[PDB]
Amino acid sequence: TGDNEWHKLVIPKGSDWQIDLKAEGKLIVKVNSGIVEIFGTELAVDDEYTFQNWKFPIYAVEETELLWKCPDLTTNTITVKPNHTMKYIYNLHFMLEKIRMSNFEGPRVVIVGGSQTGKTSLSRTLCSYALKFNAYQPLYINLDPQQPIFTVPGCISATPISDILDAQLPTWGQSLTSGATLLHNKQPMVKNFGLERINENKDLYLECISQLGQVVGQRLHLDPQVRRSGCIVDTPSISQLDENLAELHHIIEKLNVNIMLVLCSETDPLWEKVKKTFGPELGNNNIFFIPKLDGVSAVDDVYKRSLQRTSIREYFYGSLDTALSPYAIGVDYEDLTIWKPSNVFDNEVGRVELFPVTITPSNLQHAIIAITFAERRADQATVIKSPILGFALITEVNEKRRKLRVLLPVPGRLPSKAMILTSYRYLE
Amino acid sequence: IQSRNWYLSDSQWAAFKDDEIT
Numbered sequence: 001t002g003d004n005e006w007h008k009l010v011i012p013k014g015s016d017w018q019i020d021l022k023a024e025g026k027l028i029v030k031v032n033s034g035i036v037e038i039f040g041t042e043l044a045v046d047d048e049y050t051f052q053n054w055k056f057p058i059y060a061v062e063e064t065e066l067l068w069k070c071p072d073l074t075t076n077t078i079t080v081k082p083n084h085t086m087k088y089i090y091n092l093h094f095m096l097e098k099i100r101m102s103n104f105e106g107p108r109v110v111i112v113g114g115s116q117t118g119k120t121s122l123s124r125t126l127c128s129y130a131l132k133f134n135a136y137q138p139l140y141i142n143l144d145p146q147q148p149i150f151t152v153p154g155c156i157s158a159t160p161i162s163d164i165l166d167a168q169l170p171t172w173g174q175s176l177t178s179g180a181t182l183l184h185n186k187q188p189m190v191k192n193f194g195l196e197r198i199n200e201n202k203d204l205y206l207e208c209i210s211q212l213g214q215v216v217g218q219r220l221h222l223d224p225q226v227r228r229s230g231c232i233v234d235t236p237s238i239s240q241l242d243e244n245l246a247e248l249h250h251i252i253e254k255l256n257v258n259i260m261l262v263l264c265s266e267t268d269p270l271w272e273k274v275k276k277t278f279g280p281e282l283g284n285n286n287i288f289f290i291p292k293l294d295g296v297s298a299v300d301d302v303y304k305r306s307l308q309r310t311s312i313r314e315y316f317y318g319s320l321d322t323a324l325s326p327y328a329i330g331v332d333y334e335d336l337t338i339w340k341p342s343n344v345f346d347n348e349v350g351r352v353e354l355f356p357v358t359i360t361p362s363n364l365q366h367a368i369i370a371i372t373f374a375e376r377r378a379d380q381a382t383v384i385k386s387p388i389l390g391f392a393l394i395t396e397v398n399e400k401r402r403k404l405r406v407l408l409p410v411p412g413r414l415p416s417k418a419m420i421l422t423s424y425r426y427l428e
Numbered sequence: 429i430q431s432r433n434w435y436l437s438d439s440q441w442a443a444f445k446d447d448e449i450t
C-alpha cells in the first residue's frame with residue numbers, strides 16, 4: 001500500500017499537487033519552507049494540517065518543500081502538474097481590488113459556467129485573497145444548494161469573509177461556536193431550499209434568492225466594510241438551469257449584480273448568448289470570459305453526497321481540531337410542527353407553498369429539519385418567509401409511543417418554533 | 429467543551445458587525 005512515515009516533497013513554483021483522498025484516508029501535511037495556497041489560503045509554516053475525504057490542489061506560490069504522511073499515497077503516484085491559468089485568477093482579483101477602492105461601493109460578481117469548470121474554486125480563491133492583500137470582507141454568496149459551504153446542504157447562503165478560511169476543509173470553514181477557537185468562525189445567512197436539486201421547485205428556489213437578496217441588501221446598507229468590499233456570487237452549472245437562463249436574470253436583479261464572470265472558451269456558443277442575454281443589463285464591458293482553469297477535475301454524484309454527509313456531521317460535531325458537543329433530546333410527537341416544500345414527484349407542479357407533515361417513521365427518520373423563527377402556530381405564509389435558526393437531526397421515530405429523539409446543535413430546549421423538513425438524510 | 433450556535437434573525441444579522449467575531 002502506502003506508508004505511515006513522512007516524505008519530503010519539493011513542489012516547483014507555479015505547480016499544483018492535485019490530491020484525491022477517498023474513504024477514511026487521512027493526509028497530514030507540514031511545510032518547512034516556501035509559500036503554499038489551498039484555493040488562496042496560505043499554509044502556516046511548521047505546523048500540521050490534516051485532510052480528509054476531498055479532492056483539492058496544493059499550489060506553490062514560491063519555491064516550497066514540505067513533509068507529508070498518508071497510508072493511501074506513495075511517491076510513485078503523486079501528481080505534480082504546472083498550473084498555467086493561475087495568472088488569470090491574479091489579474092482578475094487586482095481587477096476587482098481596483099473596483100473596491102475607486103468605486104463608491106465594491107463589485108458584485110456572478111461566476112457562471114458549465115459543470116465542473118472552476119466556479120466554486122475560483123470563488124474561494126477570490127475571497128481567500130480579497131482579504132489577504134488589503135483586508136476586505138467580501139460577501140460570499142453560495143447559490144448552489146447541492147454544495148455545502150459554512151452550513152449543511154440544500155440551502156443558499158451569504159457569508160462575509162471576516163478573516164482566513166480553513167484550508168483543511170472542503171466546506172471552507174464553519175459557523176460560530178459557543179466558545180473561542182484558533183480560527184475565527186463565520187456568521188452565515190441561510191435560507192433553506194430543502195430539496196435535492198433546483199429543478200424540483202423552480203419558483204421556491206427563486207423565492208429563496210428573493211428573500212436572501214433582501215437581507216443581503218439590509219446588511220450592505222448597514223455595514224460599511226462589507227459594502228465597501230466586494231461581493232462574490234457563485235452559481236450552479238447552467239446545465240441545472242433553463243436554456244434562456246431565466247434564473248440568472250432573477251439572480252442579477254435581486255442581488256444587484258453589476259459584473260459577470262463566464263468560465264468559458266471561445267468555441268463555446270455559451271459566451272455569445274451570455275453577451276446577447278445579459279449585455280443589455282450589465283453592458284458588454286462588464287462581462288468577462290476566463291479560459292477554463294487547470295486541474296479542475298470532474299466530480300461524480302457519490303463524492304458529492306459524501307461531501308454533503310461530511311458537512312452534516314461537521315455542523316453538529318465539528319472537525320478533528322474543533323470537536324463540538326451537540327445535544328440529544330427526547331421529545332413528544334405533539335412537541336413538533338413540521339411542513340415540507342412542494343416537489344415534482346409529490347405535487348407534480350411545484351409552487352411556493354408547504355404542506356403540513358404527519359409523523360411517520362418513513363417521513364422523519366435520519367431527516368435534517370430546518371428550524372425557523374416563526375411560531376409553532378403561524379400559518380404557511382409566515383413560515384415560508386421566516387429566517388432559519390438552525391438545523392436538527394432526527395435519530396429515532398418511535399411510533400408505538402408518541403416520542404422522538406432529536407439531535408440539536410445547542411444544549412438546551414427544543415426550540416418551540418415552526419420547522420421545515422428537507423430531502424436530506426444522515427445516519428451515523 | 430464547546431457547541432454550535434443558532435443563526436441570527438434577518439434584522440439581527442443585518443446589524444451584525446464581523447469585528448465582534450474578531
Ligand SMILES: Nc1ncnc2c1ncn2[C@@H]1O[C@H](COP(=O)(O)OP(=O)(O)OP(=O)(O)O)[C@@H](O)[C@H]1O
Pocket residue numbers: 016018019055056057083113114115116117118119120121122144235236237293294295296297298299
Ligand atoms: N487546480 C486544481 N487542481 C486539482 N483539483 C482542482 C483544481 N481546481 C479545482 N479542483 C477540484 O475540482 C473539483 C470541481 O471544481 P469546482 O467545485 O470548482 O466545480 P464548479 O466549477 O463549482 O462546478 P460545479 O458547481 O458543477 O461543481 C473540486 O473538487 C475541486 O477541488
Ligand SMILES: [Mg+2]
Pocket residue numbers: 119120144147234235236237
Ligand atoms: Mg459549484
